[PDB]
Structure formats: C-alpha cells, structure tokens
Design a binder for this molecule. Structure first.
Ligand SMILES: [Cl-]
Ligand code: NA
Ligand SMILES: [Xe]
Length: 240
C-alpha cells in the first residue's frame, strides 16, 4: 500500500497474509480474506506458482511476534475455472483456499462479510484497501499492516480512455487513482473494504495496478468484484 497509514490491530480481522516456503523461512506474497473458519478468498494470480503456501491469520507485523497469530497450511486450491494467467484484464482473478485446520475466531480473527450478489457501489463510495504490499513503486513490503482510503471509481469513468479503457471489465471494481495512494505488489489477493449501511463489507479482491507504477493518477487500483462471484464462491465451498 502506497500512501497508507498503519492499521489498528483489530480493525480488519479478516485480513490474512498468504506466504510461501522460501529456503528455511516463509515469505509474504499476497493478502487474502478469511471467509470461513477453513476457507480464504484470494486472487488467482497469487497462486499461479507451484509453491508451498501457508496462511497467517491474526497477523499484524510480518517480522515481529504479535502474540495473536495462527499459522495454517493450505490443503486445497480452487482457482476460478475461467482464469487465464496471461490475461489478467479478462477478469476471473479469484481463488479459494481450503485450510488444513479450522482457525479460532477472536478480536483479531473474524470472517469477512461479503456483499449481496450483484451489488454495485455508487461512484466515489468510501473504501479502504489493506495490506503489507510495497509502500512505494519498486519499494519494499510494509512490516505492519497498512490501510489507505481509496474511493471507488465507477465502471463508466474507470473504463474511459484516460483511465483504464477496455482493460477494466464490469466484473471488477476500481478504487483510488489520485496519484498518491494505491495498492502495490504484495497487496494482491487482499480485501477492499467498503462501508455500506453502516457495516464494512469486502467488495474487492486486489488484482492489478498499472505497469507504469502503483500510485499513478487516473490508474486506480483494480479489484475483482466480489459481488459478481457469490454463487461461484458458495458452489465451491458446498462441494469441497
Ligand atoms: Cl475484517
Ligand atoms: Na507477527
Ligand atoms: Xe497490485
């Protein structure tokens, strides 16, 4: 997250860190949203590589003991069947991870609330991106979870020529684009939390930013629109 602020420890209890085994250690690679005690929602592109993955819930600082973490292996990966790794712009950037164990809920570990199917936010709706991604274009991961206020940019504006043009689809949510704050590498897969009817819900799964940089004016961060995939999500969890 570029231009973020440190999140309070118990603000976003559904945020997880998706990590891969690297030598004798574990490296953060993407975010995710806990949606069941044994299921996480993340981006399909995060699990393209044939790596060994684990999920950390109740995580605040990647590099220090928070005293609240639970570490759990990934038992099964279900990517959306229409996902194509060489075409992120086609959409379908979503995957569900079944955990080896069911995590315990508390003030640091909760399920993320998903929007009702078909919900589209009005232009400029209040949302926060959260994650441990790069704090600057070509920078380094954050140590502590960051948040940045990124208002939505509706489909009509987002798909206009000076924004993303044809690259953005109606199955995506755009947010931000002010040139100061944005998602960045390492934030992929995580949530876009939007306040609707007094409750935050996870409306987006972080998918991509411009190849020119993270915080680029008129290139808002692009997310998979969660409300387009409610039936798919329910179908996977029910058959697995
Ligand atoms: Cl949450
Ligand atoms: Na930690
Ligand atoms: Xe990203």
């Amino acid at each position: 997250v570029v231009g973020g602020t440190e999140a309070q420890r118990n603000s976003w209890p559904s945020q997880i860190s998706l990590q891969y085994r690297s030598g004798s250690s574990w490296a953060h690679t993407c975010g995710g949203t806990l949606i069941r005690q044994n299921w996480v929602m993340t981006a399909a592109h995060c699990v393209d590589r044939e790596l060994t993955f684990r999920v950390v819930v109740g995580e605040h600082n990647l590099n220090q003991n928070d005293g609240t973490e639970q570490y759990v292996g990934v038992q099964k990966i279900v990517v959306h069947p229409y996902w194509n790794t060489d075409d992120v712009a086609a959409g379908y950037d979503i995957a569900l991870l079944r955990l080896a164990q069911s995590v315990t809920l508390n003030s640091y570990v909760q399920l993320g609330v998903l929007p009702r199917a078909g919900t589209i936010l009005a232009n400029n709706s209040p949302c926060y991106i959260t994650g441990w991604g790069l704090t600057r274009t070509n920078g380094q991961l954050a140590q502590t979870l960051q948040q940045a206020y990124l208002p939505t940019v509706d489909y009509a504006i987002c798909s206009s020529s000076s924004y993303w043009g044809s690259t953005v689809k109606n199955s995506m949510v755009c947010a931000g684009g002010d040139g100061v704050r944005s998602g960045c590498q390492g934030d992929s897969g995580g949530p876009l939390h939007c306040l609707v009817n007094g409750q935050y819900a996870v409306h987006g799964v972080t998918s991509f930013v411009s190849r020119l940089g993270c915080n680029v004016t008129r290139k808002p961060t692009v997310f998979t629109r969660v409300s387009a995939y409610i039936s798919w999500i329910n179908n996977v969890i029910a058959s697995n």
